[PDB]
Each structure stands twice: as C-alpha cells, then as structure tokens.
Design a binder for these strands. Structure first.
Ligand SMILES: [Zn+2]
Ligand SMILES: [Zn+2]
Length: 57
DNA sequence: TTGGGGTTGTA
DNA sequence: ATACAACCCCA
C-alpha cells in the first residue's frame, strides 16, 4: 500500500485510530503470546482472553 | 469456546 | 505522548 499514516500496520492493511490499539494489534503478528492459563497451560494474545478462558475451569 | 474488530480508562 | 489495563461484540 501507499498509506503513510503512522497508525497503519506494517504487516497488513489495518489502520488504527489509537496508538495503543496499533500496539495491541501488532501482537497478532507474532507467534509469541504473553499470557497463559496457569491451570492448563494454554497461551493467549490478550490478558482479557485468559479471564474469559477461566470459565472453562 | 477463541481471535481480533470496537471503544475506553488509569498512571 | 507511553505502559499497562477494561468490557463488548462479531465471526
Ligand atoms: Zn496488521
Ligand atoms: Zn486453562
């Protein structure tokens, strides 16, 4: 693309409105996930995903 | 159920 | 401005 917007994702067409949303989005462009369930070991990209997941246990 | 879009808050 | 968050909602 020829979008020079500083909030455009370098890896896909996504363009953020907020700097912190771009930061969050960039975490989908990696295999390393920062959060884990201490019961079953599953790995999640967002902290809120572990909270939602806890209903499993 | 999960991944990632939204809008949003605090320090 | 950045470092952590939050809940909602669709797919
Ligand atoms: Zn992207
Ligand atoms: Zn678990």
């Amino acid at each position: 693309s020829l979008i020079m917007n500083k909030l455009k994702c370098p890896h896909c067409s996504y363009v953020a409105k907020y700097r912190r949303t771009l930061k969050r989005h960039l975490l989908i462009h990696t295999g390393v996930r920062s959060f884990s369930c201490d019961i079953c070991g599953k790995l999640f990209t967002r902290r809120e995903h572990v909270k939602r997941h806890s209903l499993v246990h």
